[PDB]
Design an enzyme around this catalytic site. Sequence first.
Site, PDB file in Angstrom:
ATOM      1  N   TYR A  17       0.846  -1.195   0.000  1.00 33.09           N
ATOM      2  CA  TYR A  17       0.000   0.000   0.000  1.00 33.09           C
ATOM      3  C   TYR A  17       0.882   1.245   0.000  1.00 33.09           C
ATOM      4  O   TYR A  17       0.409   2.347  -0.273  1.00 33.09           O
ATOM      5  CB  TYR A  17      -0.914   0.034   1.233  1.00 33.09           C
ATOM      6  CG  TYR A  17      -2.003  -1.011   1.219  1.00 33.09           C
ATOM      7  CD1 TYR A  17      -1.947  -2.120   2.057  1.00 33.09           C
ATOM      8  CD2 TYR A  17      -3.070  -0.910   0.331  1.00 33.09           C
ATOM      9  CE1 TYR A  17      -2.925  -3.104   2.006  1.00 33.09           C
ATOM     10  CE2 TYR A  17      -4.050  -1.885   0.270  1.00 33.09           C
ATOM     11  CZ  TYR A  17      -3.971  -2.978   1.104  1.00 33.09           C
ATOM     12  OH  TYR A  17      -4.928  -3.954   1.015  1.00 33.09           O
ATOM     13  N   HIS A  22      -3.638   6.599  -1.497  1.00 35.96           N
ATOM     14  CA  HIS A  22      -4.041   6.827  -0.114  1.00 35.96           C
ATOM     15  C   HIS A  22      -2.873   6.752   0.870  1.00 35.96           C
ATOM     16  O   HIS A  22      -3.089   6.629   2.078  1.00 35.96           O
ATOM     17  CB  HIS A  22      -5.089   5.781   0.266  1.00 35.96           C
ATOM     18  CG  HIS A  22      -6.331   6.350   0.862  1.00 35.96           C
ATOM     19  ND1 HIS A  22      -6.863   7.561   0.462  1.00 35.96           N
ATOM     20  CD2 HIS A  22      -7.193   5.842   1.774  1.00 35.96           C
ATOM     21  CE1 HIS A  22      -7.999   7.771   1.099  1.00 35.96           C
ATOM     22  NE2 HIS A  22      -8.224   6.742   1.902  1.00 35.96           N
ATOM     23  N   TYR A  68      -5.671   0.561   9.917  1.00 31.94           N
ATOM     24  CA  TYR A  68      -6.058   0.859   8.550  1.00 31.94           C
ATOM     25  C   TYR A  68      -6.715   2.231   8.436  1.00 31.94           C
ATOM     26  O   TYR A  68      -7.212   2.779   9.419  1.00 31.94           O
ATOM     27  CB  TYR A  68      -6.967  -0.244   8.018  1.00 31.94           C
ATOM     28  CG  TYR A  68      -6.244  -1.563   7.956  1.00 31.94           C
ATOM     29  CD1 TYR A  68      -6.257  -2.437   9.040  1.00 31.94           C
ATOM     30  CD2 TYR A  68      -5.483  -1.909   6.838  1.00 31.94           C
ATOM     31  CE1 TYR A  68      -5.534  -3.620   9.014  1.00 31.94           C
ATOM     32  CE2 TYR A  68      -4.751  -3.089   6.802  1.00 31.94           C
ATOM     33  CZ  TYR A  68      -4.783  -3.938   7.895  1.00 31.94           C
ATOM     34  OH  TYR A  68      -4.079  -5.117   7.858  1.00 31.94           O
ATOM     35  N   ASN A  70      -9.542   3.475   7.546  1.00 29.63           N
ATOM     36  CA  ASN A  70     -10.858   3.669   8.151  1.00 29.63           C
ATOM     37  C   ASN A  70     -10.821   3.747   9.676  1.00 29.63           C
ATOM     38  O   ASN A  70     -11.806   4.136  10.311  1.00 29.63           O
ATOM     39  CB  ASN A  70     -11.820   2.554   7.717  1.00 29.63           C
ATOM     40  CG  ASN A  70     -12.682   2.952   6.522  1.00 29.63           C
ATOM     41  OD1 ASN A  70     -12.540   2.410   5.420  1.00 29.63           O
ATOM     42  ND2 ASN A  70     -13.585   3.910   6.740  1.00 29.63           N
ATOM     43  N   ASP A  95      -3.997  12.618   0.737  1.00 30.74           N
ATOM     44  CA  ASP A  95      -4.310  12.677  -0.682  1.00 30.74           C
ATOM     45  C   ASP A  95      -5.693  13.333  -0.737  1.00 30.74           C
ATOM     46  O   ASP A  95      -6.545  13.108   0.141  1.00 30.74           O
ATOM     47  CB  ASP A  95      -4.368  11.277  -1.265  1.00 30.74           C
ATOM     48  CG  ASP A  95      -5.199  10.348  -0.426  1.00 30.74           C
ATOM     49  OD1 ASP A  95      -4.895  10.217   0.784  1.00 30.74           O
ATOM     50  OD2 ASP A  95      -6.157   9.752  -0.963  1.00 30.74           O
ATOM     51  N   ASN A 116     -12.040   8.583   3.610  1.00 26.41           N
ATOM     52  CA  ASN A 116     -12.381   7.807   4.801  1.00 26.41           C
ATOM     53  C   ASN A 116     -11.446   7.994   5.999  1.00 26.41           C
ATOM     54  O   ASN A 116     -11.815   7.682   7.134  1.00 26.41           O
ATOM     55  CB  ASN A 116     -12.477   6.318   4.453  1.00 26.41           C
ATOM     56  CG  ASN A 116     -11.253   5.804   3.717  1.00 26.41           C
ATOM     57  OD1 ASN A 116     -10.942   6.258   2.612  1.00 26.41           O
ATOM     58  ND2 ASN A 116     -10.555   4.847   4.320  1.00 26.41           N
TER      59      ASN A 116
END
Length: 180
Positions: A17, A22, A68, A70, A95, A116
Amino acid sequence: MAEPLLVVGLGNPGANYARTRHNLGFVVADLLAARLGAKFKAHKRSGAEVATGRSAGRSLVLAKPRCYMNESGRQIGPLAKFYSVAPANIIVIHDDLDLEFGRIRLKIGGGEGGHNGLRSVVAALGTKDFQRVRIGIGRPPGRKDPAAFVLENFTPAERAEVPTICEQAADATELLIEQG
Ligand SMILES: [Cl-]
């Protein structure tokens, strides 16, 4: 002044990731810590990792949650307390879908822009009056859901610019701290 700032870079963990849209906030936060000579270390009372320093005469607490996206907000709230930081003095790098590729904007308070991470942060601080360093990634193509768009790597063309955009993003963050 005497009030310390908490700079937070948003992002998901795991190498896979590290280069997704993100995760620019993560990259910028690393950049800053590097410029400051400070290094990250575990923070068992928030589950995030922090690096401390001083910029423009202000005490700095850099951070990158380890949960994470969220769930980002749940490690920032306890983090804000441990270091006695008012929400007004929290700065989150991220971002931004409402900003076009490579465009950088400082901003305090306002909407989440469909991100989120920010939503998690608002729900955790009970306020939107926190500072933001917005790093544009432009809007997604009609063919991609916004949430899938940000979990993807930048295109071939874009990838050429991300490095420089992050240095600029870090610069904008330094200027933000310096101005108030
Ligand atoms: Cl601790």
